[PDB]
Amino acid sequence: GPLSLSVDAFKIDPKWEFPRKNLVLGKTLGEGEFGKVVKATAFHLKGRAGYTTVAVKMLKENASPSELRDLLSEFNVLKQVNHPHVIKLYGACSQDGPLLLIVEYAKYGSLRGFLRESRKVERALTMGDLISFAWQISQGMQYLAEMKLVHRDLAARNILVAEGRKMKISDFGLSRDVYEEDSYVKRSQGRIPVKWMAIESLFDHIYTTQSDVWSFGVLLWEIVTLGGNPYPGIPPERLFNLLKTGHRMERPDNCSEEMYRLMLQCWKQEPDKRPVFADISKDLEKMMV
Amino acid sequence: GPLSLSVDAFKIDPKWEFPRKNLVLGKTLGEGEFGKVVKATAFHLKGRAGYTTVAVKMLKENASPSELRDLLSEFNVLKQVNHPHVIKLYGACSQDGPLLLIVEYAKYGSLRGFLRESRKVERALTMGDLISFAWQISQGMQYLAEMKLVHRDLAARNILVAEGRKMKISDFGLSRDVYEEDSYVKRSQGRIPVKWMAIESLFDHIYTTQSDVWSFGVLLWEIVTLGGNPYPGIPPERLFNLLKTGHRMERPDNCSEEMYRLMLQCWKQEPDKRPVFADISKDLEKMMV
Ligand SMILES: COc1cc2ncnc(Nc3cccc(O)c3)c2cc1OC
Ligand SMILES: COc1cc2ncnc(Nc3cccc(O)c3)c2cc1OC
C-alpha cells in the first residue's frame, strides 16, 4: 500500500543521517498514544564539537500505520523548512534501529504548558509579551503559507518556547503541500482536535491557509487566557450545531477589544473574508504601537 | 460531512438513555489521547434497585473527529451484541452534556495489565488458566464472526477480566459489519497497532474474520508470555519487510508446542489457510483434555 511504498523508498539524503552510536537518549519530555518526544544529547552533530543537547521524537512499540506515516511526513517537511520560528531539524536515525527525529532543543517546552505554569505562585508575562508571542507565530505562518504549506494543526500545545522566549511552530506530521490546487482534502475523519478546526474543515474536510488562519484564532484565544480550554464546558460534539448557527467563543475577561476583533475576523464563515497572515502580523504590530 | 450527519441523526432508542443526575463519576481507570474510561456508580439502572458500580467511557475536551466517530460507532455496535464474553452495554448519556457510555464494570481491568501484575512478588496463573482465557475469548469471537462482525482490534489490552476471571472482549470502536461483502476496506491508514495487524490488512488495508484470526494469534502470544511485547525489540516499521519475507515470531520460552502450532496456523499468509474461530475453540478444548 501507500505506506509500505514510503517505507521501502525511505531506505534509499545522506545529509540528514546521524549515527545512533553518537546519540544518548534521556527522559521523556512528552508522550502520546503511539509516540513520544525525548530529551537527548548528540556527539559531533553537524560540525558542532562535543555534545549538543537536543530533542528526539520516536514511535512507541505499539505504533499504528497513522503514527508511522505522520513521522515520515514530519521528517519530509522539516527537511524543507528553515525559519527562525519554525523548529529546526538536525537529522534522523533510521539505519539498524527505530526511526528517530533529531531537532533543536526548546528550553521551556510547549507554549501551552508554559502559559499555564505562568499562572501560578523570573518575570511575569505581560500583555506586550503575549502580543509578541502571537506576532512571532504569525511570522512563521506567513513563511509557511508563502510556500503553500498548510500546517493543519495550529494550537498552543503544538508551539514550543525556546531560549529567550522565542516561539517555534512544531508538530508538522499533518501538514500538507498545496502548491497545485491550493487546498488539501481528507476523505476520512481527521486526527485534529474538533475545537481547533475551521467550520469548512470540520464539516467538509477542506484544509487551506485560510483554515490555518481559523486555528490561529483559537491559538490567539489560548494565549490571552494563558492556556485556557476553547469553548469551555461545551462538549466537542456540540461544535457542529454551535458553529453552523453562527456562534463563536466570547471575549475572555483579560482580552482587549482590539485582540478580540482579530479573533472574530479569523473566525468568519467565508474563508476569504478572513485576514491573511500578512494582515495578522500587521494587525499585531499596530497593537504594540 | 459523514460525521455531522451521524451527530444530527443521533439526536433522534429511548431504551438506552440514562439520566445524568443518576450517574456519579469517579477515578480514571484508563486513558488515551482523546478519551478515557472512568469508574462510576449508577442509581436505579435498568430495574436494579439502588446503586450499581459501572464503567463509563467518554471523550476528552480536545477530542478529534476520529475519536468522536469511534465512540458513536462503539455505542452502535454494543447495542447489537449480547454475549457472556462480550462487554455489556447498559446505556448512554447524550442529552444536555458530554456523551457517556455505560457498561458493566470489570473487576480486574484489562487482560494485559492483569497478566503483567501476575508476574510479580490469591492464586498463581497456571497453564490451564491461560488456555481457559484463550478459549473464553475464542467463544466470543465465534459469536461475533457468526454475526459477520469484524472486531479489527483484537489485543490483550482490549480484553477485560471481570469477576471470577471471565474474559470480556471490549473496545468495539473500530469494528465493522461485513454482512454484504464479507470484507471491510479502509482507504486511509488505520489507527490499529502495526504489530497486531494481519499481512493483508497492513499492506492492503483489507479486514475480515480471517484477519481477526491473525490478531488472535498475537493475542495467544501475549497470553503465553503473560503480557509480552510482540516482535520484541523490533521496530514496527520493519514489520513490512519481515512479514513479506515470511518471518514470524518465534516460540516463547514458556509455550507448549501444541500452542505454538496454533499461533503459526493463525499466521498463515493465505487467509483461507488459517483456522476459523470454531476450529480454534475445538483446538483449545483438545488442549485441556
Ligand atoms: C522541554 O520540553 C520540550 C522540548 C522540546 N524541544 C524540542 N522539540 C520538542 N518537540 C518536538 C521535537 C520534534 C518534532 C516535534 O514535532 C516536536 C520538544 C518538546 C518538549 O516537551 C514536550
Ligand atoms: C478495572 O479497570 C477497568 C474496568 C473496566 N470495566 C468495564 N469497562 C471498561 N472499559 C470499557 C468500557 C466501555 C467501553 C470500552 O471499550 C471499554 C473497564 C476498563 C478498566 O480499566 C481500563
Q: Ends of chain A: how far apart?
A: 54 Å
Please report the total strand number of chain A as a whole number.
11
Helix content of chain A: 25-40%
CATH homology-level superfamily of the largest domain in chain A: Transferase(Phosphotransferase) domain 1
Order of strands across the main sheet of chain A: 1-2-3-5-4
Number of domains of chain A: 2
CATH C-level name of the largest domain in chain A: Mainly Alpha
CATH architecture of the largest domain in chain A: Orthogonal Bundle
Helix and strand composition category of chain A = alpha+beta
| CATH level-3 fold name of the largest domain in chain A | Transferase(Phosphotransferase), domain 1
Characterize the biggest β-sheet of chain A. Answer: 5 strands, antiparallel
Described by its quaternary structure, the protein is: homodimer
PDB class: transferase
Keywords: transferase, RET, oncogene, receptor tyrosine kinase, chemical inhibitor, cancer
Assembly: dimeric
Entry title: The Discovery of 2-Substituted Phenol Quinazolines as Potent and Selective RET Kinase Inhibitors
